[PDB]
């Protein structure tokens, strides 16, 4: 599924991400934009042999099981393929665990390098939410 911007904002909000662990909705939308381009099917391999999955690019070394990642912990107790679904529920539930783990949204390197400290409310401008 490639979400529209306001489409994703509405879904994230319904699922309880606006202001989760203090991160505004615009932070989450900005993260998804630069992590996945709003595409639930996005996958990208990393050097440690893990892969990032779905609209928030959740990693297979810590968080989900993909069956091919050394050192994998599957802390979200989920197959990584479930993070590619058009229904964002599983990605949101797992993102809530990630952002609660100690270092907030800094886990998301595209968020960190492209969203953090910027005018993130711009990502929800024009949306009816």
Curated annotation (Swiss-Prot):
Xref: InterPro entries: Glyco_hydro_22, Glyco_hydro_22_CS, Glyco_hydro_22_lys, Lysozyme-like_dom_sf
Localization of this protein: Secreted
Tissue expression: In the egg white and polymorphonuclear leukocytes.
Gene Ontology biological-process annotations: cell wall macromolecule catabolic process; defense response to bacterium; defense response to Gram-negative bacterium; defense response to Gram-positive bacterium; killing of cells of another organism
Bridged cysteine pairs (disulfide): 6-127, 30-115, 64-80, 76-94
SMART domains, sorted: LYZ1
Residue stretches making up the C-type lysozyme domain: 1-129
Keyword line: Allergen, Antimicrobial, Bacteriolytic enzyme, Disulfide bond, Glycosidase, Hydrolase, Secreted, Signal
Any one annotated GO CC term: extracellular space
Residues given in the record as substrate binding sites: 101
GO molecular function, a single term: beta-N-acetylglucosaminidase activity
Cited function: Lysozymes have primarily a bacteriolytic function; those in tissues and body fluids are associated with the monocyte-macrophage system and enhance the activity of immunoagents. Has bacteriolytic activity against M.luteus.
Record's miscellaneous remark: Lysozyme C is capable of both hydrolysis and transglycosylation; it also shows a slight esterase activity. It acts rapidly on both peptide-substituted and unsubstituted peptidoglycan, and slowly on chitin oligosaccharides.
UniProt family annotation: Belongs to the glycosyl hydrolase 22 family.
Subunit structure of this chain's protein: Monomer.
Protein name: Lysozyme C
Source organism (scientific name): Gallus gallus (Chicken)
Species classification: Eukaryota, Metazoa, Chordata, Craniata, Vertebrata
Gene name per UniProt: LYZ
